[model samples]
Target chain A: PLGSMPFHAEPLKPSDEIDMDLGHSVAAQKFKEIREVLEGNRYWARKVTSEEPEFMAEQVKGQAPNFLWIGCADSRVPEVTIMARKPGDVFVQRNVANQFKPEDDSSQALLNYAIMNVGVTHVMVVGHTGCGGCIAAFDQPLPGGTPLVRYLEPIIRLKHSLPEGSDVNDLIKENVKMAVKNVVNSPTIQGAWEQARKGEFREVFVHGWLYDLSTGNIVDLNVTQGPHP
Target chain B: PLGSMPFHAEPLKPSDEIDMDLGHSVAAQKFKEIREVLEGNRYWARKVTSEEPEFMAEQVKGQAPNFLWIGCADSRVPEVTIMARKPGDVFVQRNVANQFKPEDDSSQALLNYAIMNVGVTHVMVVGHTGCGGCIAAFDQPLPGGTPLVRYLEPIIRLKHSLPEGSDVNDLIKENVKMAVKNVVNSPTIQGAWEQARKGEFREVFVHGWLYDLSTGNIVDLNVTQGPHP
Candidate 1:
C-alpha cells in the first residue's frame, strides 16, 4: 500500500514567481512570441541568449560545480536544452539506461572530483519514459542485432525477480529504483554519505527522475538520503 | 608520440543486409537514397520512425538486442527516433551531457544486465555537439529553483578540467573521452576485456561518439576497447 504524498501546484517560496513579464520588453516579447509559436505546435522551446558566447567564454576561466549525474544515453533527452540552463551548471556522467556500476574506478574518480574538488551537493539519476534500454532489458530483441546482450547480463536476474507478466513500463520503473539503490550503495558515494552524516561534508542528495519525451515533462521520483529498500 | 595503430574502416559485411522485398522492392534503394540525402542536407537528415500501436504491442515480447547506449538528456537526440530503429533496436540510458560515471551502481547494473543477460556486443557512449548540459554546466543558472543545480554539479567539474582557453567543441570531445574511459573501466565489462585479451570478445566493442544536432552527422571519436594500455 502506498501512502498519499502531498502535491503542490505552486512554489513554496514567495520569490519563486513564474516569469510572465514576457511583454515587459521588446526583446522579451519577441522571444516570448517565438516561444509561444513553438510551444503551440508542440515543438521544443528555446531561447538563444545574445551573451551566450561571451558568457561561455568567461565560464572557461574557472570551474565551480558540485553535482554529479549518472544518466541514460538516449539522444532526445539532452540535459541543458530542456532545462534551459546555461553552461557551468552541473557535472555529468551518462550510460545506457542511466545506470551506475559499483567498483568502477573511472566513475569513482569523476564522483571524487565532483564532490571533493567541485563540491557538488547533489547527484541525480534521471530515467525517461519509453526508454529503449529499459524495454530491451525487459526481454525483447531490437533491430540491428542484440548488441547489448553482454552489457546488460548483470541485471537479467532482476528480471526473473519481477512479478509474473510484468509490463515493460513497470520494469522500467523498477530499473530506475534499482539504479537509485545502486547509487546509495556505491563505495565512493557511501564514503561521502558517511562524511556528510558526520557533518564533515555538506548534505548531498541523490535523486531519481523520469523524463517524458512526448510531453516534455519531468517527473521527480524524489531524493533519497540513502539506499532504498 | 602515438604509436601506429591499425586504423581503418572495415568493409560492410554481407549479413548487414535489410529485407527490402517485404516492404517495398526498392526499400534498399530508398535507404541508400535517404543516407545520401542526409549527407547532403545534414540538418534535415533527422530520422523519424512510425509504427502501428498493435504492431508495437506484438513486438514487445522477449529480449534480444545488439547495442547498449549511454547518452545525454537532450530532446533532439532521441534513441529510437534518430537511429530509425524500432523499440528494441538499442538499449539506452540518458543524462545531462551524456556522461558516464564509473562507480554508479545503477549504470553498472544495467551494463551487467545488458552484457551478461542480453548479450549486447557493442557499448556506445554518445555525446552531442552543442550539448545544453555541457553548455549549462559552463555558466547557466538553474530554472524554477529546481534541483538540477545539484544534479548537474559533476559536469561542472568536467568543464573545469578542460585545458585553459579550450574551445567548447574541444571540451565536448574531452568529455566524450572521459566517458569512454569510464565505460572501458566498468566491472561489468571486465569479462569482455578478458575475452578480448584471449581473442574471444571480438564482437564486443565499446565506442565514444558525438552527434551533431545542427548538421545531423554522428562523429565517431574512435575510442574503443579496454585497458590494454
Candidate 2:
C-alpha cells in the first residue's frame, strides 16, 4: 500500500489570509502538533503492517517479554529503539531517574507482573548520563517538603554519601547501582529467585546499565545479581 | 562512518565444536541478545549523529518538552514511536495499565519535574485496548494481598461501578478517564493552575486517550480537563 500510494497526505493548505492568522497562533500550533502526532501513528501502522503482515496478530496474542527494562523517563533514552528489540521483546517501566522504592506501588506492580505473568528472566536497571533527576539531586536543593523532594530524597542522600565534589556521573551510576540493589532486595524478586531455586521457574538475573547519550552505548556495569544458593 | 565501515560487525562465529556446545545454550543466548542490544545502540548512535551532527550536543543542553505522556509500558504501545515525536518533545512515564495513584511518588516526581522544571503544558494519560491489567482486574482475580492487586484495585472497583458484563475495552477507557481525573486533581496540577491564574505560569491541560493496538490509532477520548476557576 505504501508503494502504491503516498504514505501520507499534506495537511490542508490554508488560503492566503487564513494562513497569516494561524501562523502566529498558539492554539493553531497546538492543534497542528497534535494532528502531526496522530498522522505519525497512522504512517507507522501502515508501514509496519506492510513489512510484517502478522505483526498486529502476534501483538494481539499478548506480550511475552524476556527482558524487563526499568529505565528513566527521559525522552532521549528510549530503550526499545536503542535495544533494536521488537515491541514484545521488552517489558518496560520508566519513571523519573528510574528509582525503585519499596513503597512505590506503581513500580512494584510492574515488577510483580513482569516476573509472575510476563515471565521476564532478565531485569535491567538502566540509568542515563545527563539525567535531570540526578543533576537536580546532586547539584541543587529541591523544593522542600514536596512530593518531588521526598521522591528524590534517596538520590539526594546518595549524593551526600559521596565525597563533597563527587561527579554527577558518579552519583548517577551509584543511583543505578542502588536501584538494582533495591530490585534484587524486593520481596517480588526475592520470591521469584526462591521459586527459581526450588525449580518453579527460570532464574531471574538483574543487571545495572548506563546509557551514554553522547556515545549511544549501553555500558553494562557488570554488577549482575543472579540467583544464589 | 556507516558507509565507510559496516554499521555493525557480526558477533563472533563459534568454532565447529564450540558452536555445537553453544547451540542450545541459555547463557549463550542471553549473551548474544545482550550483545545485539549494545550493537543496536551503536548503530543508531552512529546513524543519527551522521545525519544530524548536533543531535547529542542539543540533548546535552537540556530538555524542554511541551507534553507529558503517561502511557502503558506494553511493548507494543511505544508512545514516542507511535506519536512520531522526538525524544525531547514528550516527557514520559509508563507503567502497567498506565494507572496513576495519588500516592505514587515516582509518578509524582515525574509530574512535578515535567511541570515545574521541563514546563510541559500538556499531560496525556493514554491507555490501550487489550490491556492485561484491565483484563486481569475485570475478568480474573489478581493475586490477593500483593502489591499488584492493591495497585489494580481501583480499576477493579471502576469495573464494578459499571453495568454488568461490560466489555474489557470499556474498562480500559474508563480506567484512562480515572487516571486523567486523578492527574487533574493532583496537588501539583492544582498548584500549577493556581499559579497560572495569578499570571505566574501558563495553564496545564490534561487529556485521556486510547491506543488501539490492532489499528495503531490513538483515539482521543474527549475527556480533557483544562485549568479551571
Best TM-score goes to which candidate? 2
Candidate 1, residues A3-70, lDDT tens digits: the string is: 46556365444212213322222222334432232232121111212324354334535445544556
lDDT of 1 at B121: 70
Candidate 1 chain A lowest-lDDT run of ten: A40-49
Worst ten in a row by lDDT for model 2 chain B: B17-26
lDDT of 1 by residue, B47-122 (tens): 1113344433333333366778787654445544444344445666655566667755556666776777667777
Error of 1 at A152 (Å): 1.2
RMSD of each: 23.1, 7.0
CA-based DockQ, model 2: 0.45
lDDT of 2 by residue, B86-106 (tens): 667778888989988887766
Deviation from native of the Cα of residue B39 in model 1, angstroms: 38
In terms of TM-score, how similar is model 1 to the real structure?
0.45
